[PDB]
Design an enzyme around this catalytic site. Structure first.
Site, short mmCIF file in Angstrom:
data_model
loop_
_atom_site.label_atom_id
_atom_site.label_comp_id
_atom_site.label_asym_id
_atom_site.label_seq_id
_atom_site.Cartn_x
_atom_site.Cartn_y
_atom_site.Cartn_z
N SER A 39 0.63 -0.93 0.00
CA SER A 39 0.01 0.03 0.35
C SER A 39 1.17 1.21 -0.13
O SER A 39 0.93 2.25 -0.38
CB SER A 39 -1.41 -0.11 1.21
N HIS A 159 10.81 -14.10 10.00
CA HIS A 159 10.22 -15.18 9.83
C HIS A 159 10.63 -16.08 11.18
O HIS A 159 9.46 -17.09 10.63
CB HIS A 159 9.68 -16.11 8.57
N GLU A 168 14.34 -18.19 4.00
CA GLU A 168 13.85 -18.98 2.72
C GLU A 168 14.17 -20.20 1.95
O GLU A 168 16.21 -19.54 0.85
CB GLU A 168 12.43 -18.48 1.52
N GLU A 211 3.88 -19.28 4.15
CA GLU A 211 3.44 -20.20 3.38
C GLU A 211 3.30 -21.26 2.88
O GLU A 211 3.84 -21.94 2.13
CB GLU A 211 4.91 -18.89 2.43
N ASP A 246 16.29 -17.71 -0.83
CA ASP A 246 15.86 -16.65 -0.70
C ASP A 246 16.33 -15.81 0.31
O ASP A 246 16.33 -15.87 1.78
CB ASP A 246 13.86 -16.36 -1.14
N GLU A 295 17.71 -16.28 -4.57
CA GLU A 295 17.40 -15.20 -4.99
C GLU A 295 17.73 -13.68 -3.81
O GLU A 295 18.80 -14.63 -2.77
CB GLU A 295 15.94 -14.96 -4.41
N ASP A 320 14.55 -10.19 -6.79
CA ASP A 320 13.39 -9.86 -6.52
C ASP A 320 13.23 -8.24 -5.78
O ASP A 320 12.53 -7.79 -7.09
CB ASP A 320 12.65 -10.94 -5.71
N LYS A 345 5.56 -11.20 -9.85
CA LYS A 345 4.76 -11.27 -9.29
C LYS A 345 3.53 -9.90 -9.73
O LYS A 345 3.78 -8.78 -9.93
CB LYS A 345 5.32 -10.25 -7.55
N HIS A 373 4.32 -16.46 -6.21
CA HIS A 373 2.95 -16.10 -5.22
C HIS A 373 3.32 -15.08 -4.07
O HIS A 373 4.69 -14.47 -4.59
CB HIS A 373 2.58 -17.59 -4.14
N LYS A 396 7.51 -20.46 -7.85
CA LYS A 396 7.72 -20.23 -6.51
C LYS A 396 6.41 -19.93 -5.95
O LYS A 396 5.55 -18.94 -6.26
CB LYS A 396 8.80 -19.61 -5.64
ZN LIG Z 1 12.34 -12.54 -2.53
#
Ligand SMILES: [Zn+2]
Ligand SMILES: [Zn+2]
Lengths: 436, 436
Positions: A39, A159, A168, A211, A246, A295, A320, A345, A373, A396
């Site tokens: 946003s 995360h 990731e 995820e 990632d 990534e 990315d 994306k 995603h 992915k």
């Molecule tokens: Zn990424």
């Protein structure tokens, strides 16, 4: 022709509101559901959030819904546009917005209409969506290419608790012969991973992130990589399954340096690494583990660390946060030779036409494309038909857990079944699936 | 008429295979996806698992897929049955099986065909599935009743570390005025719950279980109930949101006694409770917290503890492991006055007709019915139309997280929008939604 356009508020995989669009034509009602996005965003299309802390924690999309219903719909019906002419639809949406980052109507309102049209065009043409999407991108159709799924199995960084800064860890069953086989193999590695995790870190360690992968309290990259190599081994798929990373390095980039213990929070500043020291740590990892894709290895504006690394990497390097699906950003990345694969994306740019345009330019420069995603996904399977229409050979779309993830993997199984002999599994050629 | 019946293997929310069925008629292709069930089961319909440890960890459904393709399909096409006559479809499937627990063809193979037919019947009749399902069950249609969602927010017992033996804590926004409002309210309590959890138990505490709720390391029921009351409070919805419990007491029932610290594993046997001592602990909880529903309070064969408790409970008592959606089991429960609500799991009995039959008998005895999801769900939204067609006024379909859960909640939002003034939200009358 299009007789109606409606939007309603629905919920994403995280329980946050998102926009659902319904498009009516003489052939029926076509729907799309937008993944959650940004946003606030420089270089990216911005989705519009109500911001009213007293409703949905300020994440409503009531305005975005209004933009579609009160603004686009009335205009869209009158314009009497051919849904088959995707560019015509998108140029129309964009002109209605008149901003460069779709901040007037919102990327969420616009995308919802842009994707539903392609559904309606397919219907009208009487072909499967993937085939219409292949028509639009001028992609080779004999055969069609099924992609290697890069499945999220374990998460770190922001995360997870623990000291692990890499975000990731993915497994990629490049050794499989069909998509159905790679999915089976991948699910068996995943399930072994869960068993091991719950055993070494505790029952809690078994719960999943947004995820679908686990988030044990892990201290180092070797620690995590060792766990995955055990799971591959335990599933009996050694050699057939590769690793994808990632790093999301923008997250621990500070003062021109990289802090591998950024959760510290007494991070020994003496231990921060320069681009080049970081490249030496990746080189190390790359030598010990079967890593085939990395990534966001360097920060989103750390141009020279990318170029330098790129020169001697020898594996796929995915942009990315560096390109945020922004063509001005992609052109620079190409010119600087910072990488050789783009994370695509669709909601980062806001329209189907611009998303196809961004992949085409990557392909022309010899880059591969990984369709992706979002963190806040839905039950909509659009990216599955998109990955096949684009012939990228790699997607992915999360772990083999949580249906916002499996909906897409389940859709790839159907497409494969339907294509019969007209389909090939990208395999070890995931990188350049487009030239297969 | 039905021209084709096909089955393929796809994946459930946990990454385990499940059966997908496709039914072709002159009106198109109708599909259903079965939730994962039991392969070993007394009193319950058994789904068929390949059991080959070298594939999918022995959870394939390849046989089940074969039963549909090689056995039912050929017979089904030739029988030329009217899909409108649901009983005729189901009696046909059952007779083809010839076992009482659908162990010859498998509950998974049979259900898949039973649900797809109802999709095809609706199409043929030109009505929404919920309306066809209301026709089948002879339910009142003016107005239709939207249900109060019993959202899973926190899990214990076998699904968590810590000493907490109670399995599921649900919130139910009975105070809302529409389904959309109850869903919003519920998501805001949920999100506050996550914030609090991550703050008091750690980042890891924030990951989710199979159904979407958290699993912090919690020691007692008060501990958990206190956390939820804080989240309700923090979201500002005090008074509008009630609590639901799923004790799953079969799990800590040992030697005629209940072990509240069954993860012990040095459980002081001196502290195990008899039915009556357990009833006193529930009475306590009931007095301190806004609990309006209690599922499986006593063990699955502990008949006298249920009856005794029932006499003075005064809130809704849900039979789940006690009735396992088995009519012989329901009749006894009714006769013994062990409870006054049935947890309905369509795949526990295997056919749509028998599932409607089990709800009808409950209703006739003055029991309420809670339509329910399985641990291993899919992207299929069948139970959403079923809850509305049945007019039960209450559904348990997980937390407001993970799309196998939100797919159903999203489907209830669409149905509500479409019914306009012909719909009422069950509210505080969730129990007897059928008599509204
Ligand atoms: Zn990424
Ligand atoms: Zn239960």
């Amino acid at each position: 022709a299009v007789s109606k356009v409606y939007a309603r508020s629905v919920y994403d995989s995280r329980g946050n509101p998102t926009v659902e669009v319904e498009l009516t034509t003489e052939k029926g009602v076509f729907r799309s559901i937008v993944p959650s996005g940004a946003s606030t965003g420089v270089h990216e299309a911005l989705e519009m959030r109500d911001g009213d802390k007293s409703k949905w924690m300020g994440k409503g999309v009531l305005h975005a819904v209004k933009n579609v219903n009160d603004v686009i719909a009335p205009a869209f019906v009158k314009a009497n546009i051919d849904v088959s002419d995707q560019k015509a639809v998108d140029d129309f949406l964009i002109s209605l917005d008149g901003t460069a980052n779709k901040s007037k109507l919102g990327a969420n309102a616009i995308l919802g209409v842009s994707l539903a049209a392609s559904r309606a065009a397919a219907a009208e043409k009487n072909v499967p969506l993937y085939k219409h999407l292949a028509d639009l991108s001028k992609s080779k159709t004999s055969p069609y290419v099924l992609p290697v799924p890069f499945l999220n199995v374990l998460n770190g960084g922001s995360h997870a608790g623990g000291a692990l800064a890499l975000q990731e860890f993915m497994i990629a069953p490049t050794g499989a012969k069909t998509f159905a086989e790679a999915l089976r193999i991948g699910s068996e590695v995943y399930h072994n991973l869960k068993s091991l995790t719950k055993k070494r870190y505790g029952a809690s360690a078994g719960n999943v992130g947004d995820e679908g992968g686990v988030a044990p309290n892990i201290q180092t990259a070797e620690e995590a990589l060792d766990l995955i190599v055990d799971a591959i081994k335990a599933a009996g798929h050694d050699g057939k399954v590769k690793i994808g990373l990632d790093c999301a390095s923008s997250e621990f980039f500070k003062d021109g340096k990289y802090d591998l213990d950024f959760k510290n929070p007494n991070s020994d500043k003496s231990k921060w690494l320069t681009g080049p020291q970081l490249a030496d740590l990746y080189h190390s990892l790359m030598k010990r583990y079967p890593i085939v894709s990395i990534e966001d290895p360097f920060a989103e504006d750390d141009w020279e660390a990318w170029s330098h690394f790129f020169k001697t990497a020898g594996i796929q390097i995915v942009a990315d946060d560096l390109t945020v699906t922004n063509p001005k950003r992609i052109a620079t990345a190409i010119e600087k030779k910072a990488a050789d694969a783009l994370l695509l994306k669709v909601n980062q740019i806001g329209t189907l036409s611009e998303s196809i345009k961004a992949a085409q330019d990557s392909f022309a420069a010899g880059w591969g494309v990984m369709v992706s995603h979002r963190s806040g996904e839905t039950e909509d399977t659009f990216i599955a038909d998109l990955v096949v229409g684009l012939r990228t050979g790699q997607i992915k779309t999360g772990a083999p857990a949580r249906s916002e993830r499996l909906a897409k993997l389940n859709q790839l199984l159907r497409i494969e079944e339907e294509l019969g002999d007209n389909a090939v599994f990208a395999g070890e050629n995931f990188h350049h699936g487009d030239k297969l």
